[PDB]
C-alpha cells in the first residue's frame, strides 16, 4: 500500500510550534513525500521560496535513513493561476520547453518524480492536459535510457463529478500516470451560506441533491471512467474547515455568516490545523454524522468540520476494501507533527492512524 504525504513550503513561517521543516518528518511514516509547490518561470520549472534549495536538500536527506522513501516535487497549487497552466499547455512550444526543463531540475535536487497540481483545468483544457501528461511521461521514459531509475509522474485530480467531466480525460491520462491522488476533501462548496462537512465518506440517507459530493461516489465514478484501482489514491485531510454561525442553530443546514476565525498558528479564516482543532475541542460539543461517518464541533458561534483518528481509519478501511493503491494525506505540517497538542504523546496521530489500517493487511 502507498502512503503519499504532502509537505508545504510555507509552513516554515508559522510562529512557535506551528513552524515545520522537513526535519520533523518521520522517514518511515510515508512511502512518498511530496514537496509542495515548485513554480514556473520562462516556461521552466523553478523554485518558489528563497530557501527551497536548502529545504529540498533537507527533505531528500531523509532518504539516507530510509532508502526506500521516494520524494516528488509538485508544480502548481492554489496560489498558481490555472490560466498560467492553461497558457503553458496549449502552445506546444512552451509545453515542450517546460517538459525538457524538469528532469535536470529534479535530478539536481534529488527528487524521484514530479507531481502535477494543475488546480482545476477547464472545459477548453482537457485536450492539452492529456498532451502534457503524454509528453512528460515520454520524456521521462527517454531520460531513463541514460541508465538511471525512471522518474515518477503523478497528478492531483479533483473529486467533483462536474469538475471531472469538464477538464479530465481520466481514461487517457490514467495509463501514463504512476498514481492519481483524489482530492476527496473539497466537497462542501465555499460558494454558499450553509453549515456542512467538506470530506464526507458516504452520501448519507438525509439529503437528495448533491449525492456526488462524497468520497464514495468520487471513487466509484473514477473507477467507472476507467482509472485502475491500483493507480488511485484517496486523499485524506489532516485539517478542518471552520464556519461562523449566523444563528444559535448548530445542526445540519444551519445558517452561516462567514468563515470561522483564524487559528493561533495557521492564521487563515476558515481553516484549522488538526493540532489547532485538538485545542479547540476543549469546552466544545462534539457531534458525528452517522450516515457520512465524519465529525464536527461547535463552541460559541464557531462550527468546525474535521477528521479524527476514527473517521480517518474508517476512510482507510474503505480505501482497502475497494482495493485502491493507497492513501494521500494533505499536509503533514497540519497534523500534530510535534505530538504535543493532541493529548496522546503520539507524533503524527492522524497520519499514523491511516498507516495502521494500511499496515494490518
Ligand atoms: C514564479 O512564476 C512567475 C513567472 O516567472 C514569477 O512571477 C512575476 O514575474 C515578475 C517578477 O516580479 C513580475 O514583474 C515584472 O514584470 C511586470 C510585468 O509583468 C512589471 O510590472 C514589474 O514591475 C516587473 O518588471 C511579473 O509581473 C510576474 N509575472 C507573472 C506571470 O505573474 C513568480 O514570481 C514566481 N515565484 C513567486 C515567488 O511567486
Amino acid at each position: 500500500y502507498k502512503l503519499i504525504c504532502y509537505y508545504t513550503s510555507w509552513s516554515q513561517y508559522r510562529e512557535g510550534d506551528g513552524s515545520c521543516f522537513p526535519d520533523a518528518i518521520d522517514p518511515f511514516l510515508c512511502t512518498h513525500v511530496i514537496y509542495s509547490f515548485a513554480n514556473i518561470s520562462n516556461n521552466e520549472i523553478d523554485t518558489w521560496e528563497w530557501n527551497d534549495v536548502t529545504l529540498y536538500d533537507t527533505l531528500n536527506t531523509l532518504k539516507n535513513r530510509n532508502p526506500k522513501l521516494k520524494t516528488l516535487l509538485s508544480v502548481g497549487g492554489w496560489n498558481f493561476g490555472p490560466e498560467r497552466f492553461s497558457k503553458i499547455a496549449s502552445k506546444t512550444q512552451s509545453r515542450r520547453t517546460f517538459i525538457k526543463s524538469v528532469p535536470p531540475f529534479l535530478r539536481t535536487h534529488g527528487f524521484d518524480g514530479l507531481d502535477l497540481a494543475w488546480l482545476y483545468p477547464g472545459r477548453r483544457d482537457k485536450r492539452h492536459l492529456t498532451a502534457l501528461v503524454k509528453e512528460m511521461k515520454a520524456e521521462f521514459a527517454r531520460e531513463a535510457q541514460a541508465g538511471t531509475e525512471r522518474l515518477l509522474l503523478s497528478a492531483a485530480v479533483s473529486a467533483g463529478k462536474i469538475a471531472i467531466d469538464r477538464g479530465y480525460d481520466i481514461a487517457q491520462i490514467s495509463r501514463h500516470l504512476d498514481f492519481i491522488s483524489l482530492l476527496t476533501y473539497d466537497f462542501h462548496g465555499a460558494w454558499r451560506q450553509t453549515v456542512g462537512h467538506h470530506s464526507p465518506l458516504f452520501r448519507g440517507n438525509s439529503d437528495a441533491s448533491s449525492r456526488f459530493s462524497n468520497a464514495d461516489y468520487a471513487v466509484s465514478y473514477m473507477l467507472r471512467l476507467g482509472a485502475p484501482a491500483n493507480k488511485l489514491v484517496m486523499g485524506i485531510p489532516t485539517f478542518g474547515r471552520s464556519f461562523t454561525l449566523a444563528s444559535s442553530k448548530t445542526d445540519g443546514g444551519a445558517p452561516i455568516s462567514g468563515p470561522g476565525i483564524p487559528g493561533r498558528f495557521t492564521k487563515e479564516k476558515g481553516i484549522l490545523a488538526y493540532y489547532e482543532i485538538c485545542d479547540f475541542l476543549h469546552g466544545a460539543t462534539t457531534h458525528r454524522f452517522r450516515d457520512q461517518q465524519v465529525p464536527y464541533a461547535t463552541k460559541g458561534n464557531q462550527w468546525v468540520a474535521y477528521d479524527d483518528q476514527e473517521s480517518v481509519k474508517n476512510k482507510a478501511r474503505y480505501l482497502k476494501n475497494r482495493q485502491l493503491a493507497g492513501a494521500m494525506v494533505w499536509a503533514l505540517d497540519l497534523d500534530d507533527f510535534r505530538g504535543t497538542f493532541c493529548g496522546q504523546n503520539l507524533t503524527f496521530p492522524l497520519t499514523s492512524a491511516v498507516k495502521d489500517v494500511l499496515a494490518r493487511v
Side-chain angles (χ1 to χ4, degrees), residues 75-97:
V75 215
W78 292 281
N79 290 106
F80 187 104
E83 332 77 45
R84 297 178 55 198
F85 237 115
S86 189
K87 220 172 195 256
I88 306 287
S90 304
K91 302 139 170 59
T92 112
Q93 89 243 337
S94 36
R95 182 173 69 235
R96 178 222 59 204
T97 293

Side-chain angles (χ1 to χ4, degrees), residues 85-100 114 116 118 121-140 142 153 155 167-177:
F85 237 115
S86 189
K87 220 172 195 256
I88 306 287
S90 304
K91 302 139 170 59
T92 112
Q93 89 243 337
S94 36
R95 182 173 69 235
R96 178 222 59 204
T97 293
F98 170 64
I99 286 174
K100 268 218 54 179
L114 182 74
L116 288 184
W118 184 347
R123 192 194 76 251
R124 305 200 187 79
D125 293 304
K126 177 181 298 200
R127 210 228 303 179
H128 310 298
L129 201 215
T130 300
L132 180 57
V133 179
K134 237 164 195 165
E135 281 162 37
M136 186 74 83
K137 177 64 178 290
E139 175 75 356
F140 284 8
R142 210 132 49 227
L153 177 63
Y168 300 90
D169 188 335
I170 302 301
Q172 289 288 74
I173 64 177
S174 285
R175 55 194 250 83
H176 299 301
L177 293 164

Side-chain angles (χ1 to χ4, degrees), residues 231-295:
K231 276 184 172 181
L232 259 187
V233 166
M234 199 176 99
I236 290 185
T238 235
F239 60 101
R241 245 135 185 169
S242 64
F243 297 108
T244 298
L245 298 166
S247 85
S248 53
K249 211 168 183 303
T250 171
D251 52 289
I256 273 311
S257 60
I261 66 177
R264 199 224 283 202
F265 309 85
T266 255
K267 291 185 171 68
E268 205 193 314
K269 358 221 165 170
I271 290 169
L272 282 182
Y274 178 62
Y275 60 74
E276 286 179 320
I277 292 169
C278 289
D279 185 46
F280 178 95
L281 257 47
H282 298 304
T285 305
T286 51
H287 306 291
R288 188 177 302 262
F289 296 131
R290 61 144 274 173
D291 291 319
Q292 291 130 95
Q293 315 202 83
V294 282

